[PDB]
Design a protein around this nucleic acid. Structure first.
Ligand SMILES: [Mg+2]
Ligand SMILES: [Mg+2]
Ligand SMILES: [Mg+2]
Ligand SMILES: [Mg+2]
Ligand SMILES: [Mg+2]
Ligand SMILES: [Mg+2]
Ligand SMILES: [Mg+2]
Ligand SMILES: [Mg+2]
Ligand SMILES: [Mg+2]
Ligand SMILES: [Mg+2]
Ligand SMILES: [Mg+2]
Ligand SMILES: [Mg+2]
Ligand SMILES: [Mg+2]
Ligand SMILES: [Mg+2]
Ligand SMILES: [Mg+2]
Ligand SMILES: [Mg+2]
Ligand SMILES: [Mg+2]
Ligand SMILES: [Mg+2]
Ligand SMILES: [Mg+2]
Lengths: 129, 218, 88
RNA sequence: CGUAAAGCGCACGCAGGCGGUUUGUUAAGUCAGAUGUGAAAUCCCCGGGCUCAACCUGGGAACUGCAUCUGAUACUGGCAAGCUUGAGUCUCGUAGAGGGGGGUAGAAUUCCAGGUGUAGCGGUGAAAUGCGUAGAGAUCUGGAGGAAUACCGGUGGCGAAGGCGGCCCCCUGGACGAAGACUGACGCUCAGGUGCGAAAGCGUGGGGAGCAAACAGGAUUAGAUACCCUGGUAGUCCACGCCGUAAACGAUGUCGACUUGGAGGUUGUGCCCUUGAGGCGUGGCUUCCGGAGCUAACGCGUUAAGUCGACCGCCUGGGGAGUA
């Protein structure tokens, strides 16, 4: 049941990507957006798009580089059944450094590179590479 | 733009999802391919085709079916080009080194047709040895001499030539091929949409390919 | 499963107006209705085990709906159970 | 946790876990900093002293912890007020062996009665036991009784599972579709709990045609407590109440979101000179095949065994034992 939408984002992506699907859409939200941001700003998607008002619609443009899909993997990490939180010094780094981790903090949804510089930490939403 | 008079498209259901991007069909229980997307695939097609033919063209106009076999042993055959117009004896590329002597027996025989022993032995052996040579001739004509290793490959019907193409893929050989609405692409590097078993889209492109190897750098 | 005449009657006895059909109180009442109607069907028969499943559904549906209201507007809840006559 | 150990036979639901979307507020979870504390020894790093080493020792580092104060507000939790797609309610229809009750029909069997008719019938691999001269079987006619519903009938349909097939009425559950109208997160799951649950079996009463555990007879066999035959009691049927198990199986828990296709079956509904017995769409359910992908493999494959999330149940070598 709708229960975890953030996995649904992470997933609709993972799926559509593997389906060499040009775009992909879904119900939006403050939260979905903050991440669609980091995803773009880190260059895993071409560009997003929210086209509604009462029933908003997040839309992401996917990317394919060589023949592959750019996003080689995208997992949840925190989730309703089991919340994760890491302090700053205990923040994770994906693929040794390549690829990234999306961490929400008292100063907004930002990557691990980011939050690590910001000198803080929060709930580690998901891993991307 | 178009030049294919009536090859439009072809092939009904039996379609391959992956061949959607080159379809705009929907005429009476059969797809017409996207004519206006096939020609931008003569661009690139005969291009890297010729771009190597001047670098020196070694080809393999591979295409079979008792219904277009002879129309492949043609100007396709004639030029800077080799060919196969019958049963693609499997492993003929991947096992050339075994098959290399399936050749020695063709020559060492015909070279001896109006030469060597011939009208002699028995008039049993006679056509009872030209059967040895007739058999060899088709499937192992075009091969005859391979002077310059199989270099690109041009095939009439992608999947009908399962094996051929696969072998290429295995050996790193460009594979230029036309692919019907039904056939799997992706086995083909330089993919050519449109009908692949009608007397025209053959000859046309076929004969049109013969016209670009046969001339590149004088 | 209850009449259009009858169901209508009660929407019009409980809601703001006919049309205010999906109001908590209305649902509850038109359920409550079918429940009590039914009490006499299963009075005889009794071995109508299958139909019974539907009846419990009605009760457990109503039960959750009644639970909702209470949390929402407690004031509306009490009126309801009084007027409908249950929750001894 | 399909087939190897492992999805409770099925459902409803309390507690519990989890929960769409918006704004404000809170600052508990979370995060930040500061302060204090975290005994010494030990461990570790760099040294120092015993001829080396073990050993001894200086000094650091570390003790990943806890508390207090002040801050940060994205996420989670709390409070508030909303929102409409999640979930319900409402309207007209549709298909259905979904359930409960009552009524009724034809075909056959067995039996009873009678016509005709006469020496066999019946049964097996072969036999015999059995049945017939008190007239059998055969045939025809009338009647009694119980039990099940041929044809339709179909990888057809309904139900949560069990499981539900003549016809008719009455009572009743669910599912689906088309329009818009109403409620406004009312939801998902669910240990405990409660209900349901084939066949057999038990209890009191009925009921008894056919079938048939037990039992009896006849055979077969080396034996034959069997398979076969002639008989046949419980039972199989009805009401009421028990029992609570099945290879109760898709051997696959429930809900939701996402992901190439192909040929059917079944059931709604929109549009098209209805001008074709159709033409093009658009839902529900269903069968076969097959792509990615998944698998130990077989195989599964938009009805997942693929990709993800919420919750529950269960597994941890065979035997012993689902026993004590
Ligand atoms: Mg097992
Ligand atoms: Mg089960
Ligand atoms: Mg939310
Ligand atoms: Mg210490
Ligand atoms: Mg020393
Ligand atoms: Mg909040
Ligand atoms: Mg009779
Ligand atoms: Mg009679
Ligand atoms: Mg109904
Ligand atoms: Mg029971
Ligand atoms: Mg029974
Ligand atoms: Mg009894
Ligand atoms: Mg017997
Ligand atoms: Mg059991
Ligand atoms: Mg089954
Ligand atoms: Mg399959
Ligand atoms: Mg399908
Ligand atoms: Mg699954
Ligand atoms: Mg026991």
């Amino acid at each position: 049941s709708m229960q975890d939408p953030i996995a649904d984002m992470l997933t609709r992506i993972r799926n559509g990507q593997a389906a060499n699907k040009a775009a992909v859409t879904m119900p939006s939200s403050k939260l979905k957006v903050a991440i669609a941001n980091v995803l773009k700003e880190e260059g895993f998607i071409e560009d997003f798009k929210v086209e509604g008002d009462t029933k908003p619609e997040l839309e992401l443009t996917l990317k394919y580089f060589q023949g592959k899909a750019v996003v080689e993997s995208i997992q949840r990490v925190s989730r309703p059944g089991l919340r994760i939180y890491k302090r700053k010094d205990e923040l994770p780094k994906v693929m040794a450094g390549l690829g990234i981790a999306v961490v929400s903090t008292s100063k907004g949804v930002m990557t691990d590179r980011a939050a690590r510089q910001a000198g803080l930490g929060g709930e580690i939403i998901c891993y991307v590479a | 733009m178009l030049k294919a008079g009536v090859h439009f498209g072809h092939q009904t259901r039996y379609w391959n999802p992956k061949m959607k991007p080159f379809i705009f069909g929907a005429r009476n229980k059969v797809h017409i391919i996207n004519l206006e997307k096939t020609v931008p695939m003569f661009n690139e097609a005969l291009a890297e085709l010729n771009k190597i033919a001047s670098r020196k063209g070694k080809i393999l106009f591979v295409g079979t079916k008792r219904a277009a076999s002879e129309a492949v042993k043609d100007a396709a055959l004639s030029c800077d080009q080799f060919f196969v117009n019958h049963r693609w004896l499997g492993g003929m590329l991947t096992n050339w080194k075994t098959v290399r002597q399936s050749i020695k027996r063709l020559k060492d025989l015909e070279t001896q047709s109006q030469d060597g022993t011939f009208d002699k032995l028995t008039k049993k052996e006679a056509l009872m040895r030209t059967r040895e040579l007739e058999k060899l001739e088709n499937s192992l004509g075009g091969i005859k001499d391979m002077g310059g290793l199989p270099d690109a490959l041009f095939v009439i019907d992608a999947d009908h030539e399962h094996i051929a193409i696969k072998e290429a893929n295995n050996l790193g050989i460009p594979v230029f091929a036309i692919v019907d609405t039904n056939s799997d692409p992706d086995g083909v590097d330089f993919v050519i949409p449109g009908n692949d078993d009608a007397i025209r889209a053959v000859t046309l492109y076929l004969g049109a390919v013969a016209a670009t190897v046969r001339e590149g750098r004088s | 499963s209850l009449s259009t005449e009858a169901t209508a009657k009660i929407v019009s006895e409980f809601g703001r107006d006919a049309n205010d059909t999906g109001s908590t109180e209305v649902q509850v009442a038109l359920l409550t209705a079918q429940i009590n109607h039914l009490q006499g069907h299963f009075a005889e028969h009794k071995k109508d085990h299958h139909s019974r499943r539907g009846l419990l559904r009605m009760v457990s549906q109503r039960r959750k709906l009644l639970d909702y209201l209470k949390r929402k507007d407690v004031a509306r809840y009490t009126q309801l159970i009084e007027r409908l006559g249950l929750r001894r």
